[PDB]
Each structure stands twice: as C-alpha cells, then as structure tokens.
C-alpha cells in the first residue's frame, strides 16, 4: 500500500547547478509504454 | 489528507523498510504522476485516499481526484529545469537543455539525466515554473547512460 510524502515547492531556482547535454535520438514508442533506439 | 501544489515522494512499505518507488505533482486538487510507478494503485495521503481518475499505460501517464491538469510544453529553445527528488535526498533542481526523441508520431523533448528508477515522476519545470511534463520514461544510449522523455499529458 503507497503514500505520498510532500517534498518540495515546484520553483525556476536561478543558479541551479547546469549540466547534461541534447542528444537527438531515433526512437519507437511500443503499445506497452516503452521508447526503443532505431538504429 | 494533504492537498497542497507541490512535488511528493511516492512510498510503499510492501518492502523491506520504507522505499521510494516514485514522485508526482499536485496542482489543482489533482495528483500527476507515471503509470509504471503506481501501476494504477490507490494511495494514502496520510489517512486521506487518492482514487486513480484517469490513466493510460502507453503514455505511461495516471493522475488520482481529477483529470490532468498540467498542459504547458517545451518552447524547443530554452534550457529547462528537472526538480530530481531522489531516493532518501532532498530535491534539487537541474538546469540542462533537452535534446529530442524522433518518432514517426513527431518529436518530443528529452533530457539527457541519469538519476535512480526511484526519481520516476519528478517534475520538468520552464523558466515561469510551469510543469512542462515528467521525467522517468526513456532509454538507454549506446554509452550505459539513462535518457528521458519529457513525458507531457492533455487537458480536457
Ligand atoms: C534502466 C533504467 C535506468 C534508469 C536510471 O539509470 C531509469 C531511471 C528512471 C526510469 C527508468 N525506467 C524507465 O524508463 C522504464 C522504461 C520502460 N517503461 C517504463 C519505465 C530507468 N530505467
């Protein structure tokens, strides 16, 4: 049996910590939700 | 129970201590959160109930009280920000610019963050806090690393 536990407000934070990078994918989305790569 | 706006931590107690299996967002009386997290499950806000409403397992969406409330979207230019809550740490926001999922159906917003299954449900933010969708359903690259979708529902 799940609960919920309140953990944060939902706010832009200026200087939050800017990283990862913008990979453009080929994907396909099956009937059960999951992305596969195209390749 | 507690209905306040914000982002939660989704529990169980099924298991071995207490684990996180999930996050979601309340906004407007409504809880927004992925299908695979809950799997359509009723939940407990304290001693409060929340009844699924709405739910679709290949958008790997389900909100609880109400339909989906959160219909902002990814611009296509501007860095966004995800508000990780992972497991047993306190939420942080990253700043990161999305990269693209291609698909015949169109493209979709991705960004390129590796944090714990746990995290799944975290809220993707624009630069006026909007949610423009949910963070934990992806792929994983050639490399190793974890991939998401910025994972968007409509509202009615
Ligand atoms: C292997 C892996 C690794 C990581 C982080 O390293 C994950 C992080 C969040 C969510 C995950 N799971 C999904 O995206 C599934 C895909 C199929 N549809 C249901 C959700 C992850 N899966």
Same mark, same amino acid.
């Given at each position: 049996?799940?609960?919920?536990? &309140? ?10 910590? %800017?990283?990862?990078?913008?990979? &453009?994918?080929? %994907?396909?989305?099956? $009937? ?5 790569? %195209? $390749? | ?5 914000? /982002?939660?931590? =989704? ?8 684990? !996180?299996?999930? =996050?979601? /967002?309340? @906004? ?8 695979? =997290? ?20 290949? !958008? ?34 990253? @700043? ?34 909007? /949610? ?6 992806? /792929? ?11 994972? @968007?529902?409509?509202?009615?």
């Amino acid at each position: 049996d799940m609960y919920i536990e &309140r953990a944060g407000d939902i706010t832009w934070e200026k200087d939050a910590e %800017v990283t990862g990078n913008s990979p &453009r994918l080929d %994907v396909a989305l099956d $009937e059960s939700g999951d992305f596969s790569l %195209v $390749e | 129970g507690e209905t306040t706006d914000g /982002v939660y931590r =989704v529990m169980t107690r099924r298991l071995l201590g207490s684990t !996180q299996v999930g =996050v979601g /967002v309340m @906004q407007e009386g409504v809880f927004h959160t992925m299908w695979h =997290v809950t799997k359509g499950a009723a939940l407990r806000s304290g001693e409060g109930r929340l009844d699924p409403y709405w739910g679709d397992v290949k !958008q790997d969406l389900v909100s609880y009280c109400g339909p989906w409330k959160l219909d902002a979207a990814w611009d296509g230019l501007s860095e966004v920000q995800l508000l990780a809550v992972p497991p047993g740490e306190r939420a942080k926001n990253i @700043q990161t610019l999305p990269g693209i999922f291609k698909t015949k159906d169109g493209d979709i917003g991705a960004v390129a963050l590796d944090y714990p299954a746990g995290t799944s449900g975290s809220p993707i933010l624009d630069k006026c806090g909007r /949610v423009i969708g949910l963070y934990g359903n992806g /792929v994983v690259i050639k490399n190793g690393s974890y991939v998401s979708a910025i994972t @968007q529902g409509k509202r009615e």
